[PDB]
Nucleic acid binder design. Structure first.
Lengths: 98, 96, 114, 79, 127, 151, 206
RNA sequence: CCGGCCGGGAACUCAAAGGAGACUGCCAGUGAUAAACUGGAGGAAGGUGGGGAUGACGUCAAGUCAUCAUGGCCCUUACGACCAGGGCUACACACGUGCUACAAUGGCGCAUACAAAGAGAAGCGACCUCGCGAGAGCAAGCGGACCUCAUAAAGUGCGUCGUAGUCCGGAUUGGAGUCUGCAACUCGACUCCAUGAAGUCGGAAUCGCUAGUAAUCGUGGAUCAGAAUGCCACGGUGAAUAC
């Protein structure tokens, strides 16, 4: 009943990471819940596009922090011993809750 | 290049880091009523440059005090330039 | 009937009458009626003399009209005796709280004079 | 208008006031602080308040009880 | 056992579950009159039911969320129309003739830069 | 406006009477999106008008709208001397649109207490021919008959 | 003046981000500051080596930096000692352990940043700028794809009337989001002023 | 245990990835047998469905040397720096952009069901306690579908005010204060009490808007120690008219 929560900027990277996570959980076979679609947080910024003066001209930027949680509920000894070093992705933020 | 301005800013950051957070959290606790004094005549002796209100959030690329953003720590022009260069991760140009 | 005024406050409600008296607004009028025991929805017209007497005592136990007006007057006079910033803005006819005089000072300035 | 839990007195203003009441009557000295709170116990000083290019003397009297020292010094010049 | 219709009206989403039963309906654990029957735009949830004219034939149960009162009413109406889609296709043709099948693609517009509102430009003088 | 025609936008009829014309009257009397307030005012004024009249409300309301609506509209086309007023056949949409607009404008001009009472007085004066909107209609009609040129 | 930055509009689908790591806000600001310091010192040190791109990945107590370079031998130096040394000073300036990575870029005169740097170096050498653009477009057509556009602006012969010259053959569709147009700019300092060079070029068929 | 209670496929809103879908596709008429135009069936949207980004060659020697960089000139024992005060907030006036209202479509007291978009650790901070108040402690929860900001308001039911310079509006002024920050006189926001200017829908002239638009009503964010009637952004009700 532990939950693994994952944050990323690239949804393709986080989906491939959680796909390898569920593939390593299911490569032998276990009762494992898939990743949940926890909502993406959007940081939006409107800043001025000219150095001196603007009236209508501003540029608009957005950061989408995509959020997943896989919630491993089934204990498997090989999964616990080797659920590290699977994705090898440097853009993925990992947290553990219970 | 406002290096005088930036040196003033980093000097007051260093002085505020030296004279803050050693007794600053106890200021309200000593001053406030627990549910004049020698303690409050000592408390009204603190200097003026040690406060964090002395600081201004300036850019770190340029030192420009206007147009600042806390998340990037940069002025608006250099936020735009780094976003268009790709040096800021995840800052795709919004289009909704 | 009437207590200390130029025009009849009757044929109206008691809170409206005690706002038409000088120096008491709506909230202090409701406080006066609450301490006097007089309901708000009744009219001050066709009110009995004893209830009017209790209202008179309620008005008299706080600061009356005229006395608070001269109290404001000697407060402004004391500021002018100070000669401070508030007294100088009172003499010049300029705002005292600190708002702008480049535009929109027309309440303190009165009508616009070229 | 300020907080009723503590008045604001400068320490340098307080030591000037204490030295002035130690000495007694004294010719005015130039003080640069306009951020001050006065009291009826220390009404009687002839301390002078600085406002820019000109320095003006201030003789405090009995009726001021909580006013700033900068209120009596006009910072701006009008015709 | 159940006949279901969602319906959406630009900020409101509903879920309509119908058993064949008594004609009294309920919306968010209270009746139509207790929810917005005192309010305006009450007849739109009766329009698909009164166009075909059944009253006591079916038993409705609707949970609606999001939006305002008329958005919720339009979502409830459109969930009733998807329930009639689940019912039959001749009545789908009748509701398409009436104008209730289509989900309303009129959403609110975004606020744009250099403008006070979505389309309202700020006033500028001649000079 | 220039390439092709863009028609007026389709409205829901009112719940109490089921009339697209009365719902359009509600939408014309409407200000600031207050549809419930506008239709409550319309329902109260129609109830007051029915109470004062007592005859057939449909026949009386068509007589009132016929007494208010213009049969000849005024139009300046800026052709000869930049001021002409030609008589032309008018759409029924323009007829009842001008009728509700003039009725609502005369209701705003009337100086009673409640706007339901203003609208009730205007709809009674439409029937007994004493209306400000009616007088506006004969202003339009006598202007058209005075300045009619191609007939 | 009125053009969008094409890399900044292609970042969503076609151009990868130059930094791909993740951080929350209170270290996001510090990571941008350290990223600029690392990139600025690395560009200053390897401007002689004529590098193309600097890509930073961080696991939040480590940094791993990949430099796309025309000549990997100049950067790796002599038996890895020089590259180990600037890895050490990058670790010292970032406060975290550092890994170095070298990615060779093929066709250096088809690489976008190197064309701008070469035209900048040629204007520092004070050869004719018109010949610099013709050599750039000729060599790009000779050993690569079929679209490139060069703009050279500012103090072109010291004329009073301002004039921007741009040379044109091939296709550079900038409004198309699918095509991979690499664009870069550079500044050349001379005794008569600074000259700005901006190059657009696509690489491959889709 | 009336607080969405717990085994449950997760039915279903929802979130978030992979996709399907809408491409004049199909049929009639028009067009020259062409492109194309009009109408109709099906369908969630039909004719770049809606909106946004995307703004060619060039013009205005248009704007920024005050974001930064740079050619020339200048000070470089002063056109440099450190300070304490003040000014950038002045005020016989003139113009531009907005906010509040001139009222009954409304004002005051009570009850009443929802929103969407967000942000939060040198923070968000429910709740305990007192006060007709801004609001004062070691109070839990959260670094975020959980916890907080956060009671949504116009609206709907009433009671009242009955067309008045008024139970309309709040300017200005005087008392008693909170929060922030070493310190609100110049020079922050508020609420506790008191007064209640002008304002009776505004001349010549002029501006925005074609549908979820205009109007109107709330809400969040950026910078921010504290201070938006501005800016960005989101939702509620939601027109009239284009011959």
């Amino acid at each position: 009943r532990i939950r693994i929560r994952l944050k990323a900027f690239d949804h393709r990277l986080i989906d491939q990471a959680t796909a390898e996570i569920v593939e390593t959980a299911k490569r032998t076979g276990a009762q494992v819940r898939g990743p949940i679609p926890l909502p993406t947080r959007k940081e939006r910024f409107t800043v001025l596009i000219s150095p001196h003066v603007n009236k209508d001209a501003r540029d608009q930027y957005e950061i989408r922090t995509h959020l997943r949680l896989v919630d491993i509920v089934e204990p498997t000894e090989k999964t616990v011993d080797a659920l590290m070093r699977l994705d090898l992705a440097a853009g993925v933020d990992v947290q553990i809750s219970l | 290049a406002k290096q005088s301005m930036k040196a003033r800013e980093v000097k007051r950051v260093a002085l505020a880091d030296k004279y803050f957070a050693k007794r600053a959290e106890l200021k309200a606790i000593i001053s406030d009523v627990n549910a004049r004094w020698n303690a409050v005549l000592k408390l009204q002796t603190l200097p003026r440059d040690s406060s964090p209100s002395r600081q201004r959030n300036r850019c770190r690329q340029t030192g420009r005090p206007h147009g600042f953003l806390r998340k990037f720590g940069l002025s608006r022009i250099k936020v735009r330039e780094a976003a268009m260069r790709g040096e800021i991760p995840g800052l795709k140009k919004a289009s909704w | 009937a009437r207590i200390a005024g130029i025009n009849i406050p009757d044929h109206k409600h008691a809170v409206i009458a005690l706002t038409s008296i000088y120096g008491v607004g709506k909230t202090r009028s409701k406080a006066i009626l609450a301490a006097a025991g007089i309901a708000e929805d009744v009219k001050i017209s066709e009110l009995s003399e004893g209830q009017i007497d209790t209202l008179r005592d309620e008005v008299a136990k706080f600061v009356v009209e005229g006395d608070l007006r001269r109290e404001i007057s000697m407060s402004i006079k004391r500021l002018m005796d100070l000669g401070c910033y508030r007294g100088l803005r009172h003499r010049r006819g300029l705002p005292v709280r600190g708002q702008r005089t480049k535009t929109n000072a027309r309440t303190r300035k009165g009508p616009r004079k070229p | 208008r300020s907080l009723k839990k503590g008045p604001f007195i400068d320490l340098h203003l307080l030591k000037k006031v204490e030295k002035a009441v130690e000495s007694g009557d004294k010719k005015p000295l130039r003080t640069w602080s306009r951020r001050s709170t006065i009291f009826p116990n220390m009404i009687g000083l002839t301390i002078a308040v600085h406002n820019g290019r000109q320095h003006v003397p201030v003789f405090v009297t009995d009726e001021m009880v909580g006013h700033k020292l900068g209120e009596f010094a006009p910072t701006r010049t009008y015709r | 056992n159940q006949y279901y219709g969602t319906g959406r009206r630009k900020s409101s989403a509903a879920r309509v579950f119908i058993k064949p039963g008594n004609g009294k309906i309920v919306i968010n654990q209270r009746s139509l009159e207790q929810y917005f029957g005192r309010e305006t735009a009450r007849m739109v949830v009766r329009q698909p039911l009164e166009l075909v004219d059944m009253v006591e034939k079916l038993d409705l149960y609707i949970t609606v969320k999001g939006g305002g009162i008329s958005g919720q009413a339009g979502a409830i109406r459109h969930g009733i129309t998807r329930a009639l889609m689940e019912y039959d296709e001749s009545l789908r043709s009748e509701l398409r003739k009436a104008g209730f099948v289509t989900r309303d693609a009129r959403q609110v517009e975004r606020k744009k830069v250099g403008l006070r509102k979505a389309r309202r430009r700020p006033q500028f003088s001649k000079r | 406006p220039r390439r092709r025609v863009i028609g007026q936008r389709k409205i829901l009829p009112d719940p109490k009477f089921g009339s697209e014309l009365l719902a359009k009257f509600v939408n014309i009397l409407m200000v600031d999106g207050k549809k419930s307030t506008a239709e409550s005012i319309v329902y109260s004024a129609l109830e007051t008008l029915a109470q004062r009249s007592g005859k057939s409300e449909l026949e009386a309301f068509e007589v009132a709208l016929e007494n208010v609506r213009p049969t000849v509209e005024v139009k300046s086309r800026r052709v000869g001397g930049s001021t002409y007023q030609v008589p032309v056949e008018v759409r029924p949409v323009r007829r009842n649109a001008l009728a509700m607009r003039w009725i609502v404008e005369a209701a705003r001009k009337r100086g009673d207490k409640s706007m339901a009472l203003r609208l009730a007085n205007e709809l009674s004066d439409a029937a007994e021919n004493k209306g400000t909107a009616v007088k506006k209609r004969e202003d339009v009609h006598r202007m058209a008959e005075a300045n009619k040129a191609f007939a | 003046g009125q053009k969008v930055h094409p890399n900044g509009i292609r970042l969503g689908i076609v151009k990868p981000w130059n930094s791909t790591w993740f951080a929350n806000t209170k270290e996001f600001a510090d990571n941008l500051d350290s990223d600029f310091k690392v990139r600025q010192y690395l560009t200053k040190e390897l401007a002689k080596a004529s590098v193309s791109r600097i890509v930073i990945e961080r696991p939040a107590k480590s940094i791993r930096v990949t430099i796309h370079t025309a000549r990997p031998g100049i950067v790796i130096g002599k038996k890895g000692e020089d590259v180990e040394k600037l890895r050490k000073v990058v670790a010292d300036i970032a406060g975290v352990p550092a890994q170095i990575n070298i990615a060779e870029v093929r066709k250096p005169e088809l690489d976008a940043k190197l064309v701008a740097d070469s035209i900048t170096s040629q204007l520092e050498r004070r050869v004719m700028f018109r010949r610099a653009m013709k050599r750039a477009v000729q060599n790009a057509m000779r050993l690569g794809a079929k679209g490139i556009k060069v703009e050279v602006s500012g103090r072109l012969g010291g004329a009073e009337i301002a004039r921007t010259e741009w040379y044109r053959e091939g296709r550079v569709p900038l409004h198309t989001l699918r095509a991979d147009i690499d664009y870069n700019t550079s500044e050349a300092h001379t005794t008569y002023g600074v000259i700005g060079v901006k190059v657009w070029i696509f690489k491959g068929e889709i």
